[model samples]
Target chain A: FKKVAKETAITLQSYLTYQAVRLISQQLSETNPGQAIWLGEFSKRHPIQESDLYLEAMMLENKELVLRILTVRENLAEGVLEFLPEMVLSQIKQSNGNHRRSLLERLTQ
Target chain B: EFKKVAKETAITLQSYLTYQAVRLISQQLSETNPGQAIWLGEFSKRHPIQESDLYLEAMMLENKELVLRILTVRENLAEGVLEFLPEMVLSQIKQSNGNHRRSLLERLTQ
Candidate 1:
């Protein structure tokens, strides 16, 4: 029932997205390559507005897997996270030092 | 640096796994018929969304504040969920309950 301001909403979105990316990142190892790609692609498209460290870590995961789909996953066309709302994309692209580090850590899994 | 990053990430991610448990609850609840108080009653029986099933039942049947209180806790619980589980689980919870679904769904991005 409370109406949140746009800025407030964005901030909350950023936080939740950061949370989601972190959680989903941990499950990646047990996930199939196809599932990883689906999840990674989802994060990329949604771009949590606080960090793309999730994307960065995922990108570094199993190179062959990346090569497999980044090249040709049927719906991988044009809808990637790079082109979300300008504000959101920029936030993700400009994530802080700590987030970048967290992302890289996910890659080791 | 990696040590710090990995530690923080592990803590954050592990916290969200609890949400996965809630997600399991939502999934189970969705199978029941809608608007049947008995079904809702049964759902409360099956899942441990809170400290006690009896507490959840009392909230549903006895209190006018039930829905509103649930709104607040649902938001918190969903946040806890996203902290440890996947986005899809939030989606599942939202899908499971129509009245509170919007509020819960928004918690994912909000």
Candidate 2:
């Protein structure tokens, strides 16, 4: 764990501490405070105030599992973007040809 | 009107991403394509973006940059999450809504 992790753990609630403990105890996990941090860029820019609560609720509630989940999600999104070209005409069949071209141009953009 | 606020918020977020996209791409394109780097160098003059127009023509150019940002964010989300920064998580949550938001929060800790 680096400075950010060491500092954050102390300030975190008891629930968060247990979470840190639980994740650490779960062998094979790589999500220790030292692991790839998601908020690095954002942290560098903004204050980590109570605004973190919303972020906390949305993405930090269950850290151990979602690291795995994001990889899966990103791959799936890529696949969909890939398949989008094929299904493009069918999906937007209602649009005329010029509109279709324009739509695809924008979508691909 | 919550709906109006939401729509305006969406517009504002889109603009925020546009500004972000511009900043990011300015750094990249300025590095590779000097000839194309015209307006970015002189925001002082023609005013690259007008006060009334964060969502007009700039939107299209910015949209292109945004697609790239999608991949960039995916690559960087974990680091952002563990660090527990709000904007990244907020942007992540906004991108996918409740389910993704829930899952990401689950993965953070020691």
Candidate 3:
């Protein structure tokens, strides 16, 4: 609800979104090698796990690449991100991690 | 490739709750504060939240503030479907037929 919370959530979600995009590139490399080459090549320039931080840094340096990552992120989120809320909510009561539950509790409030 | 990842990424419960909060707030305002809704509608028209256009424009302009705010809200709009992201990602890699799977296991686990 607050700016800070939104910021935190966005960072995490985008990181995850970035991860999803990488694997898709990998899969495409097999089924559709041509398109895969581009996304995969773009993915290789920057490392994984670190997520968008490096991409963020690219903004000041390589503006073009940063834009590319953001474009993929936006597209992936458009479709992939929609289903997440529906699934997560269904399994909400099953979450055992205290950290997850606590965060969920705070957000709902 | 795309469909599997879409199915695999686990949107976190916390993210879901956060999204619901925004949805509720927006919905309530539409009825309780028509004036606020009017402002939001007009603001949305001017700002392309769903599209990558504003983000591209922001980056081209080197406007960090605009990019961060826009990306933040846009990511928030997708909510937190990340909890399953790791699981789904790992599953895809684990179920692979190529050497990428081996590379993933080698690099990711370490």
Candidate 4:
């Protein structure tokens, strides 16, 4: 009885250790501490208190930036952007056309 | 004949692909940073992409230079905003609520 109990404890201990390691690795990859550190330093220099325009500009710039990032990722992988929800596709098409039409009317008029 | 109808249908379908490309990027940015998403909408209002199709605009800038440009901007934004953004606000941002973040930015300006 004692031998079996000791073996069971050891097996459980090993399983817990494996779980600990797995959790640590998962956190490391998900958080990317290195990127976090870099971002911290970057924010310090470009302090948000500089001006009112900064935030809006930064936000707008980030939009363009992310768009480019996503575009590049799609370009590298063929047909990656081809598949999307049908409703989403139609919504985009209508929005783009409507927006363009409005803008064109304003420009031409 | 329905030739004109067929051609118009084909053109509209083609636009579907292009618009999806833009929507995908927009959705990703919305989830990543709602503050930025708001600004993007404003920026579009001020200066819309010249092309009728956003996907074409994106494809045109898919060269190495554009890729590097994208990375640099992301790095700067992450460094400046993501580093110190509060966990609560970050979660909100992920959920596409940038009003708090925008409020914070407004306070910083004052």
Candidate 5:
């Protein structure tokens, strides 16, 4: 009886933790796929110990979900770092050309 | 400027309609299971409006038994249910073996 009770408690805790983390991630970010990073960063910035108790067990013994979160966080950060600067520069160049279109024509002449 | 304002108005109007739909569906759910309705209300408050739409769709179904089953779903268990639930829900319930049956129920009632 005691063992059964303990297992049920743990199961409930794991499921609830997963649910709470999922909810927080969804609420915090507008994007769906990027939610892993949102959750990863949020979990680290505001550690479970700092905020609330219900979330403390989220990082506990859930191997598959925890590992997936880290993998997503690192890959997303890498992709953004690699591609974002080029996209920003290209956008800026386009904007600058539009802003000075007449000036450029006159200067070229 | 006129075009932009029109688009903004349309977006706001859609959001308002969605809010009203959620309110009406949750009220109906309250009739069957007050606890589940309250849970859905709070869940919708924190989550996306689309989640509420999913519940509302289930509630609006023509089949009465299916509607009651959906209403009984408590907490966040209702999430992803309609997406996977079989079209012939009763047939699936009858044909499913013990393990398959339990899994389906968990999907709906967890």
Candidate 6:
């Protein structure tokens, strides 16, 4: 069960990238059909089932796609990301300490 | 006038959430699954959630681990972060995604 939990984490990250491409390529289809079609099609073929799509993978493969993603993902993360550290830390403080330290250590490493 | 103490770059916010999600997973696993906690502890360190080199592609990240890390972060941000967001911020995410998706769909069919 927990082993499966491990996979669950990685799968979601790749899907985030996939969705990024899907949306950006679709948005591009209007003014930039040439680049758009390639991006649109790559998302179609490169399913996240294998879980390799961290972000840079698409770079070696698609300079345009990665650049677009780099641009758009920021927009995606914009407002929420700005306040997330505060919100997350605030909530975590509301909860506990020792367990919290362990978790932070995971990130600190 | 706004002055900056800090902000989470996309990858940092994204990575932080992954660490959160994994922590949740690890805790539950430690209680229920025994050895798996250690497995994940190692995994988190190996692919320690931190601000990553923004230029690197997904394949170049530590592994499949970072892939899901960003995804989980966004999901939690929607859940946890959104909870605290005012209506204006809500409109920003929904309106953008909605309009972006709507426009995208129109182009895809043609």
Q: Per-residue error at A46 for model 6, in Å? A: 1.3
**All candidates: TM-score:** 0.22, 0.28, 0.34, 0.23, 0.24, 0.32
TM-score of chain B of 2: 0.41
Q: Quote the lDDT for B101 in model 3.
A: 27
lDDT, candidate 6, at B84 = 38
In terms of lDDT, the best-performing candidate is: 3
Runs off by more than 4 Å, candidate 1? A1-9, A50-109, B1-110
DockQ per candidate: 0.03, 0.05, 0.09, 0.02, 0.02, 0.03
**What fraction of the true interface does each of the listed models get right, in terms of native contacts kept?**
0.00, 0.02, 0.15, 0.00, 0.00, 0.00
Model 3 chain B — which ten-residue stretch has the worst lDDT?
B92-101
lDDT for model 4 comes to 0.36
lDDT for each residue of candidate 3 in A1-109, tens digit (9 for 90 to 100): 3444444444545555466567556667788787667666665776654554545443444444444445555555555655655654453333323323443464467
Go through the candidates in order and give each one's C-alpha lDDT: 0.37, 0.36, 0.47, 0.36, 0.38, 0.46
- What TM-score would candidate 3 get against the native? 0.34
**Ten consecutive residues with minimal summed lDDT in candidate 4 chain A?**
A76-85
Model 6 CAPRI rating: incorrect
Query: What tens-digit string does per-residue lDDT give for candidate 2 at A31-79?
Result: 4433335333333444433334433542434454344433433332232
lDDT of 5: 0.38
Q: What lDDT, from 0 to 1, does candidate 1 have?
A: 0.37
For model 4, the docking class works out as incorrect
lDDT of 4 by residue, A42-105 (tens): 3365543322233344454344322222233223212211122233234444554554454446
- TM-score pick, better of 3 and 4: 3
Indicate which candidate wins on DockQ: 3
What part of the reference interface contacts, as a 0 to 1 fraction, does candidate 1 reproduce?
0.00
Candidate 5 CAPRI-style tier: incorrect
The TM-score-based order of candidates, best leading, equals 3, 6, 2, 5, 4, 1
